[PDB]
Structures are given as structure tokens and as C-alpha cells.
């Protein structure tokens, strides 16, 4: 029984895999503050978004793939590490954290320090797309080109991997948050209705699609000019029109990456195509849209919200592998 853990420190969700057990925590990366003092973290805090009374706020400290607020991010990480601690497990926890590939040295050090402050003995860091590819089952250690597109909340990470390293990697700030924001802006312009982020995510999941048709649902929010509650209907067709711009940006980032490939690796990617992971991979039709623009097969990973955590967990379970990650960090 171990306290070694692997943390997918996501812009939107944090997952923790614990050695010998598997995923033991999956909660939103949200912290609620009371006037400032921490009031709630995780599942309870997300439910507060857009619903807070005076003297309270709810914050996503890792929102855009960068640390927005270092103190709040540290309290969030420590809260989750403490939550999974097993008093019957061994001590001196080894911790792997998956961080955005663009994370700077300062952010990496802050993440390291947060884990040490929560009791970690040693911390190793792995970049998002490598962990995503491992957890999606791609053969990243082989001499063959594997391409992964990980659509998260604040970012999409695109990479081509071979022989345990990176051939190409780029992230852009377009993923599920920009999809939500496009839906908010759409409702404002076309229905004079102000909606919040939770309603926007609900539209996205229930009727959002990357491909115009259709079906409709009821949406409620604040009248734009006068402020009063209002209910309106929105269709798949409207949702698809709302989402076209961020979808196109994700598709462009994928296309750009392909221009970046050595011939024999291009040959491998022509063969097997592109693997999608992350929650944004669940956007209906996004696989088809990428396929149309690239000419390549597109597969959605099994359990795409969990791939990064499963991939980190795989590394954590392999002492040789883990020792190497710790060392190169
Ligand atoms: N069914 C769905 N359709 C579209 N987007 C979805 C769906 N389910 C989850 N998402 C989106 O996935 C994003 C979260 O993906 P995730 O990989 O957990 O991000 P991160 O690793 O950055 O925390 C959110 O924007 C969420 O709304
Ligand atoms: Mg992620």
C-alpha cells in the first residue's frame, strides 16, 4: 500500500492516480474563496461557479494552461493531495505531475514546491501530450510516428512522438473554454440573452457539434439590456454555427503540425492517423472534421478524459521508468 501518486493537473479537471490502486480522485480544478480564505475546492466549488453570493468567488487557478494565481493554485493542489492520502500506506511519497507543455521553469518550480509542501519526498514532471499518448495506448517508445491531439479546457496540445521523445509539440489556447465562450457570445448576439459558463458547457455537451446538421433544447439566462430572467430555444444548427470558429482553430493547429513532419514519420501518420484525447475529443463530429481536413484516419481514445492520468499512472507503476522521470526533471 503506497502513497505514491500521479496528478493530472488540468486546466479544468484534476485527476489523481495512486500507485497500486488506480484513479482515486477526479474533480474540477476550481477553488471557492470567501472574503480571502479558501471555502471549498473541487466538486463543491464548481457547483458554485456563477452562483456565488456576496463576499465569495470561485476561481480556476490553472484556467488558460498557465498559473493565474500561484497561492490559490498551491492551495488547490495541496487540498487534493491531502484528500487522497492513505494513513495505512508507506511514506516518502513519489509524485508525478502532468503539466502543460508550455509550462515555464517558474510554473514548474511552483508545482514542484506545492507538492513538497503537501508532503511529497520527490516530484517528477511529464508534459501533457506525452502522458496523453501513453494513456491512449500509443506506442510512444517504438521507432514509429504517433500523433496525439489532446483537447482540454484551456488548451489543445498537439504532438508527434517517437522513441520516447518529442518530434513536434505545440499548444494553442483553444479548447473547451473557447467553445463555451463562443456559445455565450452566440446567445448574446442572436438571442439577447446573457448565459453563464455552466449553461454554456451544458449546451456544448447536449447539442454541440463540429458539423452542422436540428435537435433543440431550452436555455435560460439574463436579458442582455434589461436584466430579467428569460428562456430561449437553441438548435444544433445554431450550436454548430456558434462553435465553428474555435473548431476551425483546433483543426488549423492540427494541420500546422502535419506540415512539421519528417518523411518516414509522415509515412507512419498516413498509416494510422491521429489519436484524439481530452474532454474536447468528446465534441460530436470533431473527429470527422479533423479527418476531412487532413485526409487522415482519426480515432477518439477510449476514456479520453482519463488518458493523461492513466498515462502518468503507467509511468508511476514502473520504478525504472519513474526513476528516469524524476532524474530528468
Ligand atoms: N461531451 C462533451 N462534449 C464537448 N466537450 C466536452 C464534453 N465533455 C467534456 N467536455 C469538455 O472537456 C473539457 C475538459 O477536458 P479535460 O481534458 O478534462 O481538460 P483539462 O485536462 O484541461 O482539465 C471541458 O471544456 C469540458 O466542457
Ligand atoms: Mg488535460
Author numbering: 9 to 43, 48 to 225, 230 to 345
What's the paper's own text on this?
The MreB fibres are attached to the cell membrane via a hydrophobic loop in Thermotoga maritima as well as Gram+ bacteria and via an additional N-terminal amphipathic helix in Gram− bacteria. Here, we demonstrate that MreB from Caulobacter crescentus forms pairs of antiparallel protofilaments as revealed by crystal structures, an architecture unprecedented among actin-like proteins. The crystal structure of Caulobacter MreB (ΔCcMreBdh) reveals the typical actin fold, containing two domains on either side of a nucleotide binding cleft (Kabsch and Holmes, 1995).
Crystal structures of CcMreB in different nucleotide states, either as a monomer or as a polymer, were determined to a resolution better than 2 Å. It revealed that ΔCcMreBdh has the highest affinity for ATP (Kd ∼1 µM), followed by ADP (Kd ∼4 µM) and ATPγS (Kd ∼4.6 µM) and finally by AMPPNP (Kd ∼65 µM). From the ΔCcMreBdh co-crystal structures with ADP and AMPPNP, it is clear that the active site could well accommodate a guanidine instead of an adenine as the major contacts are with the ribose and phosphate moieties of the nucleotide, a feature, again, shared with ParM.
